[PDB]
mmCIF file of C-alpha atoms and ligand atoms in Angstrom:
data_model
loop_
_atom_site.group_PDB
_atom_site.id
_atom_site.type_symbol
_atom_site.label_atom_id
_atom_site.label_comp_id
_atom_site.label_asym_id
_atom_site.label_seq_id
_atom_site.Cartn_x
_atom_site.Cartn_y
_atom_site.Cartn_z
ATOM 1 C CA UNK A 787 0.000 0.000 0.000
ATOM 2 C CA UNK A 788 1.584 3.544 -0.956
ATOM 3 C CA UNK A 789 4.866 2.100 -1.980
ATOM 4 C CA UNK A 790 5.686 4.790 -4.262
ATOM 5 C CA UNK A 791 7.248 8.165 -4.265
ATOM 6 C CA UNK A 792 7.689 9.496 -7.902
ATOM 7 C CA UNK A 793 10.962 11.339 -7.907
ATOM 8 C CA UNK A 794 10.864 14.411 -10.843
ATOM 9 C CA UNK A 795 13.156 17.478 -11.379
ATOM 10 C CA UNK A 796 13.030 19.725 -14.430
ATOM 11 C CA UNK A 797 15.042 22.171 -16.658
ATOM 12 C CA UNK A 798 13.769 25.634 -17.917
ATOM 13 C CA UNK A 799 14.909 28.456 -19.942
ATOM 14 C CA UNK A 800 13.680 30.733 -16.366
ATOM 15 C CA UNK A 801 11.251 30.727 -13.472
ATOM 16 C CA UNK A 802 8.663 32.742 -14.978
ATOM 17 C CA UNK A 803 5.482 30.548 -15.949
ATOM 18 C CA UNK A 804 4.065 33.801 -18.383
ATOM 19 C CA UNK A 805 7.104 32.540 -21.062
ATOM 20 C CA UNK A 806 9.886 30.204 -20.131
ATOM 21 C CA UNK A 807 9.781 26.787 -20.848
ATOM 22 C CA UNK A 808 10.412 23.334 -20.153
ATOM 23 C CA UNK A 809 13.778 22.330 -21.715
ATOM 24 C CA UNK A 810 14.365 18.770 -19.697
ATOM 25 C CA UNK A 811 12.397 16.743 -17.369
ATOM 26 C CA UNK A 812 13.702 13.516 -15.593
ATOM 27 C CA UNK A 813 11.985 10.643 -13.305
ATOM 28 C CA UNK A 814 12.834 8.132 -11.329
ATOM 29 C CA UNK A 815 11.025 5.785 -8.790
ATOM 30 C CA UNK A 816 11.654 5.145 -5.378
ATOM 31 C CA UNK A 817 9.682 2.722 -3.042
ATOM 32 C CA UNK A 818 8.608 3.824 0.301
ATOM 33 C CA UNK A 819 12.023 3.294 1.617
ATOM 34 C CA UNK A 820 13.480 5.441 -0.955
ATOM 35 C CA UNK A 821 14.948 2.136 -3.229
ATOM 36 C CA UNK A 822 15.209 3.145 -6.902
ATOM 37 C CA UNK A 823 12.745 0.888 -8.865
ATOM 38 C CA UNK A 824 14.373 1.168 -12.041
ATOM 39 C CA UNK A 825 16.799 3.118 -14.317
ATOM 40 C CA UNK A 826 13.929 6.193 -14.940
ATOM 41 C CA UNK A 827 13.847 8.511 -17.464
ATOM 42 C CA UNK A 828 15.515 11.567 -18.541
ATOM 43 C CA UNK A 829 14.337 13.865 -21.757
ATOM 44 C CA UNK A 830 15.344 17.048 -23.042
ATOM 45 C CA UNK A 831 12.477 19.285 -24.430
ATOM 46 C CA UNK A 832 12.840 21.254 -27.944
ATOM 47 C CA UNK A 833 12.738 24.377 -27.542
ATOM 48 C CA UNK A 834 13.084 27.271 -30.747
ATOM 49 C CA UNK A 835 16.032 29.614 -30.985
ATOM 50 C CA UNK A 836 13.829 32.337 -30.238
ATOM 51 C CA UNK A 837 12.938 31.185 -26.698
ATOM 52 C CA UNK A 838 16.253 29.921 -25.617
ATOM 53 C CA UNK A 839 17.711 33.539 -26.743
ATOM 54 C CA UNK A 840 15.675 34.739 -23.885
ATOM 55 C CA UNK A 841 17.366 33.312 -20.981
ATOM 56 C CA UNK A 842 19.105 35.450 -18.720
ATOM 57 C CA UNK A 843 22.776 35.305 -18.863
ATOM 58 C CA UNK A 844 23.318 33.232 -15.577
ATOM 59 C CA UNK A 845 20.975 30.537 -16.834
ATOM 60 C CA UNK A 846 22.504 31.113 -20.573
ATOM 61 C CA UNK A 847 26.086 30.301 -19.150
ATOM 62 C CA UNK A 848 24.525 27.356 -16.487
ATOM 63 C CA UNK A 849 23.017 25.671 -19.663
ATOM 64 C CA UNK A 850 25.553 26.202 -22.487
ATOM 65 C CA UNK A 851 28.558 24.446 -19.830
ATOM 66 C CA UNK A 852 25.997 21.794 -19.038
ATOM 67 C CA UNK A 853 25.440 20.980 -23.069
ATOM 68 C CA UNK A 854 21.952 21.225 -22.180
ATOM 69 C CA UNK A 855 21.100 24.629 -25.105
ATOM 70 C CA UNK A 856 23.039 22.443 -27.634
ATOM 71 C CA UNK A 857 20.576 19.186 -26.715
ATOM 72 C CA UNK A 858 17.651 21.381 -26.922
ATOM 73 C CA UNK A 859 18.315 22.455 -30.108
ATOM 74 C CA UNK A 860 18.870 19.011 -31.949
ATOM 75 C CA UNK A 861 16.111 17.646 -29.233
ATOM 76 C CA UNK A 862 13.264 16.427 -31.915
ATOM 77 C CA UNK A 863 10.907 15.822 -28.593
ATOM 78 C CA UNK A 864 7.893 18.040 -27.890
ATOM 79 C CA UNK A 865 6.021 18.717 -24.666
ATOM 80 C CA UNK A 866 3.009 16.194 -24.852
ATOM 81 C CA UNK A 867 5.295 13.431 -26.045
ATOM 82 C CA UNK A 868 8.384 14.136 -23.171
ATOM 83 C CA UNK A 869 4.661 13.938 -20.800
ATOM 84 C CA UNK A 870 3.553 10.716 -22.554
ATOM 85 C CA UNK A 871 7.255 9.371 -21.939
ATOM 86 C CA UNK A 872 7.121 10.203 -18.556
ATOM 87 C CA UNK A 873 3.673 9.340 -17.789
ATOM 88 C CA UNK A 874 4.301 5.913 -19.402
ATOM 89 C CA UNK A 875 7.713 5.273 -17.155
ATOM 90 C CA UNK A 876 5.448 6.102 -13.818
ATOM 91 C CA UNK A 877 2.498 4.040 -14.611
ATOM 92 C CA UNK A 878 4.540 0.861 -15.375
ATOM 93 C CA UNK A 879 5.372 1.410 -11.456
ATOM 94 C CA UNK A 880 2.445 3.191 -9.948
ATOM 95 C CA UNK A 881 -1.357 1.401 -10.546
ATOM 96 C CA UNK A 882 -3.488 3.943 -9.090
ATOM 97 C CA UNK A 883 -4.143 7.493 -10.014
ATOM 98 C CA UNK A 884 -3.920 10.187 -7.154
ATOM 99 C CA UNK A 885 -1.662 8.005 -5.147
ATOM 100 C CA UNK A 886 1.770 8.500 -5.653
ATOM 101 C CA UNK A 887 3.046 11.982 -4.328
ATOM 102 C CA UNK A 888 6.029 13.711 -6.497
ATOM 103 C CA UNK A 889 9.538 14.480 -4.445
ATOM 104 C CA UNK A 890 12.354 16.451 -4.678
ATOM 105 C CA UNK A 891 14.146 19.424 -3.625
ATOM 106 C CA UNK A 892 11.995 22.943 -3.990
ATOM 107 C CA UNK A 893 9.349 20.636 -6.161
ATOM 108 C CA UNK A 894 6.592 23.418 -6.426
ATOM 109 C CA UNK A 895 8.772 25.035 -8.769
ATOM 110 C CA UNK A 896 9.024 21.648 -11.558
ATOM 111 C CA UNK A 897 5.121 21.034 -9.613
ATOM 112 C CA UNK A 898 3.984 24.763 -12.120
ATOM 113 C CA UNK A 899 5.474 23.685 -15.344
ATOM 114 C CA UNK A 900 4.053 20.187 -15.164
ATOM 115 C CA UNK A 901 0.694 21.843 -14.073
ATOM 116 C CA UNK A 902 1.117 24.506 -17.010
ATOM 117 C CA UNK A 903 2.782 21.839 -19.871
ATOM 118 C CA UNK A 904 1.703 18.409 -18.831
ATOM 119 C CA UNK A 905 -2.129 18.318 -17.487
ATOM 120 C CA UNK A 906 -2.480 14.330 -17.702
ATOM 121 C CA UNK A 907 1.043 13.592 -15.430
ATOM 122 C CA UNK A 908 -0.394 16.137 -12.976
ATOM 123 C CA UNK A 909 -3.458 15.187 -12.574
ATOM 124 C CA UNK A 910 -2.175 11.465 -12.609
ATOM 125 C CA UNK A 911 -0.074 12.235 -9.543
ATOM 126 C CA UNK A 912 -1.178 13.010 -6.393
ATOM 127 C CA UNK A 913 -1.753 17.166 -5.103
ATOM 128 C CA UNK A 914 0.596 16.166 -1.889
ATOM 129 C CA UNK A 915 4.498 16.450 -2.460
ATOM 130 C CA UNK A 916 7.454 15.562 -0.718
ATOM 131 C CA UNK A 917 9.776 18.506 -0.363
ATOM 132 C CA UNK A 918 12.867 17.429 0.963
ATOM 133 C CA UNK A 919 13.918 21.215 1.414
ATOM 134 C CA UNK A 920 11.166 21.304 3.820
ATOM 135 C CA UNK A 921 13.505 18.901 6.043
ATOM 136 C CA UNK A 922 16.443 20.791 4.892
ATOM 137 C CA UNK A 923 15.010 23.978 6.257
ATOM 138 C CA UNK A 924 13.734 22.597 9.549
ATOM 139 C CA UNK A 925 16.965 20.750 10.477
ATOM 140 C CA UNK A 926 18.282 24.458 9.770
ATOM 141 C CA UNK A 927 16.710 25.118 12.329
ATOM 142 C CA UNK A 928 16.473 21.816 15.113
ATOM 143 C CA UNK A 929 19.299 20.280 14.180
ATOM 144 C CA UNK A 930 22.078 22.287 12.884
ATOM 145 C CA UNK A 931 24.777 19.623 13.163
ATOM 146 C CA UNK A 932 22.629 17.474 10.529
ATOM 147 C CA UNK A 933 22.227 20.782 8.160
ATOM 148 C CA UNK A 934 25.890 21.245 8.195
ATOM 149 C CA UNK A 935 26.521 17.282 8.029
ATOM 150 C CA UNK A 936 24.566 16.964 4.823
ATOM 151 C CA UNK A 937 26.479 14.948 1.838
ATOM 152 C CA UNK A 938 27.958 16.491 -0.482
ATOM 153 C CA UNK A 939 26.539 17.628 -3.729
ATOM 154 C CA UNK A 940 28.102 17.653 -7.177
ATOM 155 C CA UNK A 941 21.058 17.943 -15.019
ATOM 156 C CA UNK A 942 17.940 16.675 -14.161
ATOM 157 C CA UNK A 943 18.452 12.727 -13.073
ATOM 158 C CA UNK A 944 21.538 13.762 -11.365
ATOM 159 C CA UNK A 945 19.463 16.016 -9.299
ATOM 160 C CA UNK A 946 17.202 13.684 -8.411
ATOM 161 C CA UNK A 947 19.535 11.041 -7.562
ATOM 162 C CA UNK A 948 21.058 13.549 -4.879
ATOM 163 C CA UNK A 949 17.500 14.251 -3.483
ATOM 164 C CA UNK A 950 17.099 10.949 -2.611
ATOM 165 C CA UNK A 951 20.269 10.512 -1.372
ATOM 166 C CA UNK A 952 19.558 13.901 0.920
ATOM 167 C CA UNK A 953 16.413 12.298 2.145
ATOM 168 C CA UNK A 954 18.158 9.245 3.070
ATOM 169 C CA UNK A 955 20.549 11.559 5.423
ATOM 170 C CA UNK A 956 17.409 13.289 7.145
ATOM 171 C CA UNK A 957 15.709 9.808 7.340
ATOM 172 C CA UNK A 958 18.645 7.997 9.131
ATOM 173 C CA UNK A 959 19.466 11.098 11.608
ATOM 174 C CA UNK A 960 16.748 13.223 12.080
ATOM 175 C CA UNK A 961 13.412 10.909 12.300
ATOM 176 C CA UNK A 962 13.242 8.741 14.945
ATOM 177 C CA UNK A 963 14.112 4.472 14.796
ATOM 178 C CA UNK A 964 10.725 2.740 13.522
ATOM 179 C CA UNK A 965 8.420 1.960 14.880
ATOM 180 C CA UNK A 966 7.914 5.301 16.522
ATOM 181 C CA UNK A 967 6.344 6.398 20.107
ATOM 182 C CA UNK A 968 3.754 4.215 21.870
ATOM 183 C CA UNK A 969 0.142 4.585 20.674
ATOM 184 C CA UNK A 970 -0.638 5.433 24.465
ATOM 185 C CA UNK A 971 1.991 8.350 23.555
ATOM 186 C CA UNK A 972 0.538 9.332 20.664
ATOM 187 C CA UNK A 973 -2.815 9.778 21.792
ATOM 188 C CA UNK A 974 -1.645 11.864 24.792
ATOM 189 C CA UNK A 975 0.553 14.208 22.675
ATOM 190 C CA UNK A 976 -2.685 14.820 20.205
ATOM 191 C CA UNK A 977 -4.674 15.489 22.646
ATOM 192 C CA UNK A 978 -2.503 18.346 24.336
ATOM 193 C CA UNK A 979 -2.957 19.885 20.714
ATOM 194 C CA UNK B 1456 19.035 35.402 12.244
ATOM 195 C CA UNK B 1457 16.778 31.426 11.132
ATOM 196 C CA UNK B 1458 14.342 31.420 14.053
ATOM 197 C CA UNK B 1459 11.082 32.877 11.717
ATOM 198 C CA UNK B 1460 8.584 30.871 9.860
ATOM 199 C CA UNK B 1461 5.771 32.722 7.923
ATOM 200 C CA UNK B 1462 2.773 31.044 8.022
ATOM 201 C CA UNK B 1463 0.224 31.625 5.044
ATOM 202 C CA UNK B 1464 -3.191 30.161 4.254
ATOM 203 C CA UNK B 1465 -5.249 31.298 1.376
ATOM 204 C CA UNK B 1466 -8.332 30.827 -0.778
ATOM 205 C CA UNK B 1467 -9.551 30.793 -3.906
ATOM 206 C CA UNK B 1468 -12.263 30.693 -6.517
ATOM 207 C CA UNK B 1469 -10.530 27.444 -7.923
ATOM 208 C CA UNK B 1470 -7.160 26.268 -8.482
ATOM 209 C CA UNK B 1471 -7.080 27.352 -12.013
ATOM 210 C CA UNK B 1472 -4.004 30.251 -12.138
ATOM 211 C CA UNK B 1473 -5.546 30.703 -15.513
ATOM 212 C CA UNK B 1474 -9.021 31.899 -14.399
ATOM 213 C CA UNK B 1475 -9.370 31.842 -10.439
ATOM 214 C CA UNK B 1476 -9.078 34.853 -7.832
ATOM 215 C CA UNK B 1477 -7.174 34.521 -4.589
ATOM 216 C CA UNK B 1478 -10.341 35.743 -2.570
ATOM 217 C CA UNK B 1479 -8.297 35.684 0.885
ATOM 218 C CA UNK B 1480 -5.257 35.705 2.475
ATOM 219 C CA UNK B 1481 -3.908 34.656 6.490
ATOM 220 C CA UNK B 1482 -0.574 35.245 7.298
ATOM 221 C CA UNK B 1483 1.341 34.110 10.887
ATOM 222 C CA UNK B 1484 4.803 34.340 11.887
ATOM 223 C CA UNK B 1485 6.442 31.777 14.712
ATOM 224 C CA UNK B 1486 9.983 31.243 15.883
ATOM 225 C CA UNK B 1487 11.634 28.401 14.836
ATOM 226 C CA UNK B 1488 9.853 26.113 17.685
ATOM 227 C CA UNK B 1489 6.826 26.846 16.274
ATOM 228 C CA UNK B 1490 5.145 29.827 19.292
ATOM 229 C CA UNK B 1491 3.508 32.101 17.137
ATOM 230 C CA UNK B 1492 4.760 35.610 17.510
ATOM 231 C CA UNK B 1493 1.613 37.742 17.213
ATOM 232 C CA UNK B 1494 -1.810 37.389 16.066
ATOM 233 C CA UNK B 1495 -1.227 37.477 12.509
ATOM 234 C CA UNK B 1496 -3.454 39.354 9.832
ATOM 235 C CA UNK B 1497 -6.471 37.844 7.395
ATOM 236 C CA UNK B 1498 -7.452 39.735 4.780
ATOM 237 C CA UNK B 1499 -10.643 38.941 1.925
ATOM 238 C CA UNK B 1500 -9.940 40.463 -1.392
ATOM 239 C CA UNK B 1501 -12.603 41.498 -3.296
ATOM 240 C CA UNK B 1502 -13.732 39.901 -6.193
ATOM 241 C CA UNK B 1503 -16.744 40.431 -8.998
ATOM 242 C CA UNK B 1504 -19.427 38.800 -8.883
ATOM 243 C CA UNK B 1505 -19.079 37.145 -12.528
ATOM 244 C CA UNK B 1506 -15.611 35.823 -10.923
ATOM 245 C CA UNK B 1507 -17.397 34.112 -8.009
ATOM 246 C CA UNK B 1508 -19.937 32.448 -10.326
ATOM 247 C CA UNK B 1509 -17.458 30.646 -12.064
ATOM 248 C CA UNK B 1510 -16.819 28.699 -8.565
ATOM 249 C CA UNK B 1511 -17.664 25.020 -9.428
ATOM 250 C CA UNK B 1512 -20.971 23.958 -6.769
ATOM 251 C CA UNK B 1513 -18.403 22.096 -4.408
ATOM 252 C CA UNK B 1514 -16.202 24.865 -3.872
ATOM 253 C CA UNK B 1515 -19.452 27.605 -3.799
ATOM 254 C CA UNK B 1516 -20.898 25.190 -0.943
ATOM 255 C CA UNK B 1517 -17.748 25.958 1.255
ATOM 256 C CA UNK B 1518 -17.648 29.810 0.549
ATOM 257 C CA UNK B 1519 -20.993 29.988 0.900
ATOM 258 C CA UNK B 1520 -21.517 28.100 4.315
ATOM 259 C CA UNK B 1521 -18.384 29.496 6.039
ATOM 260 C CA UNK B 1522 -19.241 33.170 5.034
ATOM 261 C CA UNK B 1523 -16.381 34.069 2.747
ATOM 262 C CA UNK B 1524 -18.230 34.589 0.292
ATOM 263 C CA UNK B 1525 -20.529 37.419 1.197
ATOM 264 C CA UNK B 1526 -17.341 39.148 3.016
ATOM 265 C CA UNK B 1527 -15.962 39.086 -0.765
ATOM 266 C CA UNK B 1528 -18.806 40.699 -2.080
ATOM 267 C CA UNK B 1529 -18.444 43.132 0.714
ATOM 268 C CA UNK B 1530 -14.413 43.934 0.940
ATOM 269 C CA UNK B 1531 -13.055 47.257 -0.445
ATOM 270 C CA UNK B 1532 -9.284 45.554 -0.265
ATOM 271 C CA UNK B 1533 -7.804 45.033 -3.462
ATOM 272 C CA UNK B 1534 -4.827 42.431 -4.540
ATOM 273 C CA UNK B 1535 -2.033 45.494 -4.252
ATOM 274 C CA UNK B 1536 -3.911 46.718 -0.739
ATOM 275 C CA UNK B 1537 -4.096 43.270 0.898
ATOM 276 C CA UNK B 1538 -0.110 42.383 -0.264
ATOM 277 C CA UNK B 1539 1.055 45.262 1.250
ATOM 278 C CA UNK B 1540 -0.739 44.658 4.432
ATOM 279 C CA UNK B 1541 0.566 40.932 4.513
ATOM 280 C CA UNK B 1542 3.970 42.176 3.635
ATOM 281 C CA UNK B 1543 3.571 44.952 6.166
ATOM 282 C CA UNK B 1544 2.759 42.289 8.936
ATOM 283 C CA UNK B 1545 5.792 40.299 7.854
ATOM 284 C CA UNK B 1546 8.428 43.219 7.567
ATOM 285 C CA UNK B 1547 7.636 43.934 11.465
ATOM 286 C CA UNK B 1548 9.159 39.942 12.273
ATOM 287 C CA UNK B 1549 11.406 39.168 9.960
ATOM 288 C CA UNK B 1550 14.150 41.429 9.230
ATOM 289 C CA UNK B 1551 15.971 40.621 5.756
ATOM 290 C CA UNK B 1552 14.432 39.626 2.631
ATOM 291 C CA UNK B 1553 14.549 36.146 1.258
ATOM 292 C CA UNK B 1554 15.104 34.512 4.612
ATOM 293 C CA UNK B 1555 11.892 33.386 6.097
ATOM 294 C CA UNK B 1556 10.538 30.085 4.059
ATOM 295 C CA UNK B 1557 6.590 30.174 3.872
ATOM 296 C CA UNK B 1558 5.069 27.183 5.557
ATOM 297 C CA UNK B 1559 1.781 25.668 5.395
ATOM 298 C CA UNK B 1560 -0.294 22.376 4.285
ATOM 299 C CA UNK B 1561 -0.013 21.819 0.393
ATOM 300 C CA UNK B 1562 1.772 25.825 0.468
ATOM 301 C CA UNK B 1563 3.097 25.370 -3.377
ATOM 302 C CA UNK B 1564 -1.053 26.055 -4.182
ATOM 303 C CA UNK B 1565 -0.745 29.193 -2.122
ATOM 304 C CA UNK B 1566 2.549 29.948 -3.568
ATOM 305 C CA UNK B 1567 1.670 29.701 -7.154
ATOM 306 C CA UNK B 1568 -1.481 32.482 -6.832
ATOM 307 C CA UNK B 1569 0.796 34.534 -4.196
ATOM 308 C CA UNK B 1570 3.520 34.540 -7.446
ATOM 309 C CA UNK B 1571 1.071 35.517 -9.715
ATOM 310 C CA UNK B 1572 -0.610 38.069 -8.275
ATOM 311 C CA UNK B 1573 1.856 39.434 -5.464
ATOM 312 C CA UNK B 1574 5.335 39.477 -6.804
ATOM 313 C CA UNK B 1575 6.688 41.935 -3.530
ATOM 314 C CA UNK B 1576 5.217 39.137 -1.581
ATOM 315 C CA UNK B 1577 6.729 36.248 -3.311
ATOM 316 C CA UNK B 1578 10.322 38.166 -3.563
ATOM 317 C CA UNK B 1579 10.372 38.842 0.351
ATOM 318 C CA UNK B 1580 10.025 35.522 1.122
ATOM 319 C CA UNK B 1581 12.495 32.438 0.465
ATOM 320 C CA UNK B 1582 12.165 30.478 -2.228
ATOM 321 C CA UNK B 1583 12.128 27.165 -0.003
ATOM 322 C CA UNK B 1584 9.151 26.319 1.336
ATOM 323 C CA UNK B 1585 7.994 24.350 4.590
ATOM 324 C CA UNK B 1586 5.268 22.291 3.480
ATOM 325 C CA UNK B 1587 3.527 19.794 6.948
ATOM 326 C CA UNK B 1588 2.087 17.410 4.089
ATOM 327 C CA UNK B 1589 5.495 16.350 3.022
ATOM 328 C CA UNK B 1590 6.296 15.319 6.844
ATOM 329 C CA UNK B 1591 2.760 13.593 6.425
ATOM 330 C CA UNK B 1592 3.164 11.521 3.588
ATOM 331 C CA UNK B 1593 6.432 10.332 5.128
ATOM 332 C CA UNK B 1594 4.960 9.600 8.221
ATOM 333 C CA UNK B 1595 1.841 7.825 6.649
ATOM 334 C CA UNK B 1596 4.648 5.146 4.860
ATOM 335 C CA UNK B 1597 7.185 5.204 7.827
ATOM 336 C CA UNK B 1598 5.300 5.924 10.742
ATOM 337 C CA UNK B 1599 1.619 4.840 10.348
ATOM 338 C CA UNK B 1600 0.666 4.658 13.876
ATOM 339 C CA UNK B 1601 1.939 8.819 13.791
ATOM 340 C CA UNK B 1602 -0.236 9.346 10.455
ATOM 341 C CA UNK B 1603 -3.541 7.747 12.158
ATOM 342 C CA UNK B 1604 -2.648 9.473 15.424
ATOM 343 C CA UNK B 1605 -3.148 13.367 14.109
ATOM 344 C CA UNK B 1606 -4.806 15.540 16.256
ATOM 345 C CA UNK B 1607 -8.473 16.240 14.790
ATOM 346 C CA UNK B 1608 -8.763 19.711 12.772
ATOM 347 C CA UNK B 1609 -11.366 22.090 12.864
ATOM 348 C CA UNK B 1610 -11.750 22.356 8.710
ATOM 349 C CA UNK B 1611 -12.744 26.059 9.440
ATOM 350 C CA UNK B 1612 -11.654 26.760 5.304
ATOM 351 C CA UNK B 1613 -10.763 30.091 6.427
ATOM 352 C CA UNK B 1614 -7.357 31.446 5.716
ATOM 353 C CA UNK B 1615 -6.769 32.037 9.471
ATOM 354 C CA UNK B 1616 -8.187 28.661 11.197
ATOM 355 C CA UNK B 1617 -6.227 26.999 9.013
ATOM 356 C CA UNK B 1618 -3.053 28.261 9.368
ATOM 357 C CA UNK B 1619 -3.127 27.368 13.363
ATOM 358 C CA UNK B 1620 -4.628 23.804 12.325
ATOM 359 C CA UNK B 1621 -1.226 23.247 10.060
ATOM 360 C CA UNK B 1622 0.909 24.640 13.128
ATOM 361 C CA UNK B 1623 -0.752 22.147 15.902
ATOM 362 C CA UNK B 1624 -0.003 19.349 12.953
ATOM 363 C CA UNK B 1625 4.122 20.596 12.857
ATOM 364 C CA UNK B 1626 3.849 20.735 16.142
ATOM 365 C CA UNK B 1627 2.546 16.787 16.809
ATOM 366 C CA UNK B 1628 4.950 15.575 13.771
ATOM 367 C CA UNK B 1629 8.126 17.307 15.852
ATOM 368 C CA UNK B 1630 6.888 15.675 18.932
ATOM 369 C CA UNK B 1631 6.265 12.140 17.558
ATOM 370 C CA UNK B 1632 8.371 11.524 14.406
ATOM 371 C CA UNK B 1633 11.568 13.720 14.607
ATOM 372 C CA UNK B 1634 14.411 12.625 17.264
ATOM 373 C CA UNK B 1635 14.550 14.819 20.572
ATOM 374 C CA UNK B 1636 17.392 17.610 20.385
ATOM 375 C CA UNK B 1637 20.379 18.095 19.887
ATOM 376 C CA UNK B 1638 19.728 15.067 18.122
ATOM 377 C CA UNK B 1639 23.301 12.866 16.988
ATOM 378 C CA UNK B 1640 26.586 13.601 17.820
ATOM 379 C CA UNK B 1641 28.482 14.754 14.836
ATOM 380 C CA UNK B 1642 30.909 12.009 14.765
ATOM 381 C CA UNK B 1643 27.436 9.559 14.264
ATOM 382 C CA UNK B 1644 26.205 12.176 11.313
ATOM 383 C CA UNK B 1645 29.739 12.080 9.736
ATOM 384 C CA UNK B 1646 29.360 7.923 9.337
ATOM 385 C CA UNK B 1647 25.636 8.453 8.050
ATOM 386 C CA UNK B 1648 26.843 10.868 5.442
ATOM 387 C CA UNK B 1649 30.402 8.998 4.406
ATOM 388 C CA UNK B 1650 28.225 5.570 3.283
ATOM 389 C CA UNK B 1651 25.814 7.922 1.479
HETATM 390 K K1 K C 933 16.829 21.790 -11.517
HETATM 391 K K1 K C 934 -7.179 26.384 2.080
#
C-alpha cells in the first residue's frame, strides 16, 4: 500500500510561468524506503532559438557548460510526447491514479510547469508532495549539526539522484528508529494539541 | 538570524491560475519552535461577482456556508492593498528579505497564486518552502501509527483557522516523528553521510 514516491526534477529556460519553458524533465522511482525501482527517465524538451535567446545570462552560461542549449536544439521531442514518456515510465510502477506523491528538492517550482505543460502527469499524480527542502530547512533550524553534516553535492536525473540521497541523510538522523512512540503516547501528545 | 517561519493560508475561486481569484489571504509568523509571535493578519480580497460564479458547486458550498463569500462581495481591499498589508505584517518579524521560508499544508497552491498576483510578496520571502504534508506523507509510509494518530482539525476553510490547524499538525509531527534535540553527535552524522 503507498509504496511509491515518484521522484521528478526539471530544466527551464527561467522561473517565470508567463514565457519560459520546459527544456528537460527527468523521473525516477523510489519505493517507500526510498529504493530506486528502475533506471527512470531523462528527456530534453525542444525548444526554438527564439525562446532559448531569452534566458538570462546566468541561466545562458549554467546551460551552455551543461550541453543542455546544444541538446535542446537538436532535441526532436515536444512537450506532450516528453509527458507521454514520462507518464508511461510512472504508470509501469504506480497502478493507481492520485496516489503516488512527487519528491524532490523545492518541487513546487518543476510542480507549475508540469501543471502549465503536462495536465495528464499532474493530474495522474497526487496534489501532496514531498519537499525534501522542507527537512532541509527545519533541520536548519532543530538540528544544525545534521544541516551542516549533509552529503555532499556535485542535469535533471543527477538532481534527483542527490535528493534521494539527501532524504536518506534526514531519514537515518533526524526521524526517529521505527516503529515510533507508543500509541498510548501518541494519543496523549494529540490530545494536548 | 533562522528562528522565523511565515505562516500563510489562502483561498480561492478554484485552483485554475488561468481563471481563479485569490479571494483571501492569512498570514502568521512563529519562531523556529513553532510559538507564534503575534496574532497574525487575514485579509478577503474582493472579487466580482461574474468571478465568483465561475466557482464550481463544491467549492461555492464551502464559501458559501463558512461566510467568505458574502465578506468578498463586501471587501473594499484590493490584490495590491491586501499584499502590502501581509507584507507589512511580515516586515515587522522578519528582518531581511529572502530569509523566512513560507510554511503551510499543500503551500506550493498558495505559492503559485501569491507569485502571480503578489510578486513583492513572493520576492520577500524564500524560495524554499515548509510544506507539513510532506512530513505527512512520510509519516503515513514510515510511521503509520503517527499518520492515524493526528490531532483532529477544525476544517474552518478560512485562511486564518487553518493556518493554526497546520501549526498544531508541525507541532505533533516534531513531537512524535523527529528525534529529541540536539539530536546525533556529529561524529554519528559524519558515518551516516560517508556511506551515502
Ligand atoms: K533543476
Ligand atoms: K485552504
Amino acid at each position: 500500500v503507498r509504496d511509491e514516491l515518484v521522484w521528478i526534477d526539471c530544466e527551464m529556460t527561467g522561473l517565470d510561468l508567463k514565457s519560459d519553458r520546459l527544456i528537460e524533465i527527468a523521473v525516477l522511482v523510489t519505493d517507500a524506503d526510498l529504493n530506486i525501482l528502475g533506471d527512470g527517465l531523462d528527456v530534453v524538451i525542444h525548444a526554438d532559438d527564439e525562446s532559448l535567446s531569452s534566458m538570462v545570462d546566468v541561466v545562458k552560461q549554467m546551460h551552455a557548460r551543461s550541453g543542455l542549449t546544444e541538446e535542446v536544439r537538436r532535441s526532436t521531442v515536444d512537450l506532450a510526447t516528453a509527458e507521454e514518456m514520462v507518464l508511461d515510465y510512472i504508470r509501469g510502477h504506480v497502478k493507481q491514479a492520485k496516489t503516488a506523491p512527487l519528491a524532490g528538492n523545492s518541487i513546487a517550482t518543476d510542480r507549475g510547469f508540469i501543471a502549465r505543460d503536462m495536465p495528464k502527469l499532474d493530474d495522474y499524480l497526487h496534489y501532496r508532495m514531498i519537499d525534501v527542502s522542507s527537512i532541509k530547512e527545519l533541520c536548519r533550524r532543530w538540528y544544525p549539526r545534521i544541516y551542516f553534516g549533509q552529503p555532499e553535492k556535485g542535469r535533471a536525473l543527477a538532481d534527483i539522484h542527490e535528493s534521494i540521497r539527501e532524504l536518506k541523510y534526514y531519514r537515518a538522523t533526524a526521524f526517529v528508529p521505527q516503529p515510533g512512540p507508543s500509541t498510548s503516547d501518541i494519543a496523549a501528545i494529540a490530545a494536548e494539541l
